[PDB]
Design a protein around this ligand. Sequence first.
Ligand SMILES: O=C(O)c1cc(C(=O)O)n(Cc2ccccc2Cl)n1
Length: 220
Amino acid sequence: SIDTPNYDVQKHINKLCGMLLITEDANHKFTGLIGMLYAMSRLGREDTIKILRDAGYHVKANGVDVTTHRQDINGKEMKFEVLTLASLTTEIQINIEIESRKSYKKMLKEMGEVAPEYRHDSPDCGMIILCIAALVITKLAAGRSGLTAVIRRANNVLKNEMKRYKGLLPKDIANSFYEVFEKHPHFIDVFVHFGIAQSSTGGSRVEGIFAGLFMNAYGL
Ligand SMILES: O=C(O)c1cc(C(=O)O)n(Cc2ccccc2Cl)n1
C-alpha cells in the first residue's frame, strides 16, 4: 500500500513542508517521507504509478484527499485540514500544525507580522526540502555515510534559506532522507524521475538551486 498524491494536494503538502521549516527544533522524523510525498504530487498520481510499475514494484495505490478533522486542543474544539495518508497518521499531521503554530506566535512576538518568504506557506518550502534530498542522492551515488559532507555542503548552498527558516536543520533532514531511501528504495526511482523532469524547467531561486544540485549527481 503506497500513497500516490495527485496535483490537487501539492499546495497542501508544500504547506506541511513549510510548517516543519518554521518549527524551532523541529522533529524531522517524517520529513524524508513528506518530501517524497511532495515530489509525487509534482509528478502526479499517473506518472508515479507508471514509474513504480516500470521499475518492477507492485503498487496498491492509495488515493490522497484533503479532509477536515475536528480535534480538542486545550479544551477548545479545533478544525484541521489533513490528508488521507496510510504512511502518515492524522495525529502526526495535526501535531506538526500545533508545533508550527507555537513557533509562529513566538515570531509574531519577536518581529510583528511575518513577511511572505518567512512563512509556512511560501511557495518554495517543498523545494527547499527536496534540495537536501538532492545532496543525499549524490552521497548515495558516490559510495556508506557522507553525512558530514552533506551538512557542510548544505550550510553553504542553502545559506539564504537557513536564514529564512529556523527548522531548516541539514543534519536531521539529511538523516530523514538517508533513512527513507534505505527503508523504501522505490523512492530513489521516484526522486530521480522527479529531478530529471524538474531540471528541464523553472523558475524561482530555489528551483534553480535544486537543478544545479541535481545535475551535479552526474557531472563536474
Ligand atoms: O494570518 C495568517 O495567515 C496566519 C495566522 C496564523 C496563526 O494564527 O497561527 N498563521 C500560521 C498558521 C496558519 C495555519 C496553519 C499553520 C500555521 Cl503555522 N498564519
